[PDB]
Design an enzyme around this catalytic site. Structure first.
Site, mmCIF file in Angstrom:
data_model
loop_
_atom_site.group_PDB
_atom_site.id
_atom_site.type_symbol
_atom_site.label_atom_id
_atom_site.label_comp_id
_atom_site.label_asym_id
_atom_site.label_seq_id
_atom_site.Cartn_x
_atom_site.Cartn_y
_atom_site.Cartn_z
ATOM 1 N N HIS A 1 7.969 5.900 0.118
ATOM 2 C CA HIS A 1 7.040 5.820 1.243
ATOM 3 C C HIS A 1 7.485 4.829 2.316
ATOM 4 O O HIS A 1 6.837 4.696 3.355
ATOM 5 C CB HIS A 1 5.601 5.509 0.774
ATOM 6 N N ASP B 1 7.892 7.849 -6.351
ATOM 7 C CA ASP B 1 7.997 6.993 -5.175
ATOM 8 C C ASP B 1 9.198 6.064 -5.308
ATOM 9 O O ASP B 1 9.063 4.881 -5.621
ATOM 10 C CB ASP B 1 6.707 6.185 -5.008
ATOM 11 N N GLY C 1 3.144 -4.438 2.757
ATOM 12 C CA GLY C 1 4.275 -5.229 3.203
ATOM 13 C C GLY C 1 5.178 -5.563 2.030
ATOM 14 O O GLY C 1 6.358 -5.866 2.214
ATOM 15 N N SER D 1 5.525 -3.381 -0.372
ATOM 16 C CA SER D 1 5.994 -2.046 -0.735
ATOM 17 C C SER D 1 7.506 -1.950 -0.867
ATOM 18 O O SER D 1 8.238 -2.463 -0.023
ATOM 19 C CB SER D 1 5.549 -1.023 0.317
ATOM 20 N N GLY D 2 7.956 -1.269 -1.919
ATOM 21 C CA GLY D 2 9.379 -1.081 -2.143
ATOM 22 C C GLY D 2 10.066 -2.245 -2.825
ATOM 23 O O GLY D 2 11.223 -2.131 -3.241
HETATM 24 C C1 LIG Z 1 1.840 3.510 -0.174
HETATM 25 C C2 LIG Z 1 1.122 2.515 0.732
HETATM 26 N N1 LIG Z 1 0.340 1.589 -0.085
HETATM 27 C C3 LIG Z 1 0.965 0.586 -0.634
HETATM 28 C C4 LIG Z 1 0.342 -0.400 -1.498
HETATM 29 C C5 LIG Z 1 1.124 -1.422 -2.027
HETATM 30 C C6 LIG Z 1 0.583 -2.370 -2.877
HETATM 31 C C7 LIG Z 1 -0.760 -2.323 -3.216
HETATM 32 C C8 LIG Z 1 -1.324 -3.311 -4.114
HETATM 33 N N2 LIG Z 1 -2.559 -3.761 -3.932
HETATM 34 N N3 LIG Z 1 -0.601 -3.762 -5.132
HETATM 35 C C9 LIG Z 1 -1.551 -1.314 -2.691
HETATM 36 C C10 LIG Z 1 -1.017 -0.353 -1.830
HETATM 37 O O1 LIG Z 1 -1.887 0.575 -1.384
HETATM 38 C C11 LIG Z 1 0.228 3.262 1.716
HETATM 39 O O2 LIG Z 1 -1.005 3.413 1.373
HETATM 40 O O3 LIG Z 1 0.727 3.680 2.769
#
Ligand SMILES: C[C@H](NCc1ccc(C(=N)N)cc1O)C(=O)O
Ligand SMILES: C[C@H](NCc1ccc(C(=N)N)cc1O)C(=O)O
Ligand SMILES: [Ca+2]
Ligand SMILES: [Fe+3]
Length: 223
Positions: free
Chosen positions: A40, A84, A175, A177-178
C-alpha cells in the site's frame, strides 16, 4: 509510533524512509540493493533514504538512492490488504557499514508472545497529528491468533498477525506503514494496518513475512 521511545541515532541500521518530497512510508534493507516495504506504500518517484535519524536535517551517514523498480505482490488486494508486501530495487547498491546494514529474513515463523521491535517516523499521537523528527521505537509482543481474530472478525488472513497491546496506548500508526517488525534479529513483519492508533482492543496488524521468504528470494533472483 504511539507510546514509544527515541531509538537513538542509527541504532536501527536496517530502517529506511521512503521519500517523495516528504516521508510517507518506512521499509527494511534486506541486502545491498533491495528493500522490503508494504504494497500500500507503492507510488512512482520513490527515493530511498538510508542511515537516517532526523529526517529533516542532513546529519551525516545518510545515503539517498532512487528506486529503480518497485514490485508489488501480484496477489495484493487493496480492499483486504492481503499480501501487503512490496520489493524495491535500488538504482545502485548501498554502502553497507555500521550505520547502514541489512536485516535477515526469517527461517521460521515467530510464535505468540515473541517480543519484537517496531520502528518508524509515523504519527506519535492517538488523537491528533504529530510527526517526529527522529526515529521512534516500540517493543511489542506478537499476539495469539485467537485474540487477533476476535479483535478483527473475518478480516485476518493467514498472511497477517497482530502485535501490540490490548490496553491501548502503544502501537504503530500512519507513517509507520511498510516499516519493520524485528524479532530476535529476524524480520517477521511489515507495518500494514489497524483501526485508528493505540486504541483499546484494536492491536496493530502486520504482514507475516515468514510466508513470503520463498517468493522474495525467487523474485530477487530473477530481477
Ligand atoms: C493501509 C493504511 N493503514 C495503515 C495503518 C498502519 C498502522 C496502523 C496501526 N494502528 N498499527 C493502522 C493503519 O490503519 C491505510 O489505511 O491507508
Ligand atoms: C485508520 C485508517 N485505516 C483504516 C482501515 C480500514 C480498513 C482496513 C481493512 N482491513 N480493509 C484497513 C485500514 O487500515 C487509517 O490508516 O487512516
Ligand atoms: Ca537526516
Ligand atoms: Fe489504515
Amino acid at each position: 509510533i504511539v507510546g514509544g521511545y527515541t531509538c537513538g541515532a542509527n541504532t536501527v541500521p536496517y530502517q529506511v524512509s521512503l521519500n517523495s518530497g516528504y516521508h510517507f512510508c518506512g521499509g527494511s534493507l534486506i541486502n545491498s540493493q533491495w528493500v522490503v516495504s508494504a504494497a500500500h506504500c507503492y507510488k512512482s518517484g520513490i527515493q530511498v533514504r538510508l542511515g537516517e535519524d532526523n529526517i529533516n536535517v542532513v546529519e551525516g551517514n545518510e545515503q539517498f538512492i532512487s528506486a529503480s523498480k518497485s514490485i508489488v505482490h501480484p496477489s495484493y488486494n487493496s480492499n483486504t490488504l492481503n499480501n501487503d508486501i512490496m520489493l524495491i530495487k535500488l538504482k545502485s547498491a548501498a554502502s553497507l557499514n555500521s550505520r547502514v546494514a541489512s536485516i535477515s529474513l526469517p527461517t521460521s515463523c515467530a510464535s505468540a508472545g515473541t517480543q519484537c521491535l517496531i520502528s518508524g517516523w509515523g504519527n506519535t499521537k492517538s488523537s491528533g497529528t504529530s510527526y517526529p523528527d527522529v526515529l521512534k521505537c516500540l517493543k511489542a509482543p506478537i499476539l495469539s491468533d485467537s485474540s487477533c481474530k476476535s479483535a478483527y472478525p473475518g478480516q485476518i488472513t493467514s498472511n497477517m498477525f497482530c502485535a501490540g497491546y490490548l490496553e491501548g496506548g502503544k502501537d504503530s500508526c500512519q507513517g509507520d506503514s511498510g516499516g519493520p517488525v524485528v524479532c530476535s534479529g529476524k524480520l517477521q513483519g511489515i507495518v500494514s494496518w489497524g483501526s485508528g492508533c493505540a486504541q483499546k482492543n484494536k492491536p496493530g496488524v502486520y504482514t507475516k513475512v515468514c510466508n513470503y521468504v520463498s517468493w522474495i528470494k525467487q523474485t530477487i533472483a530473477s530481477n
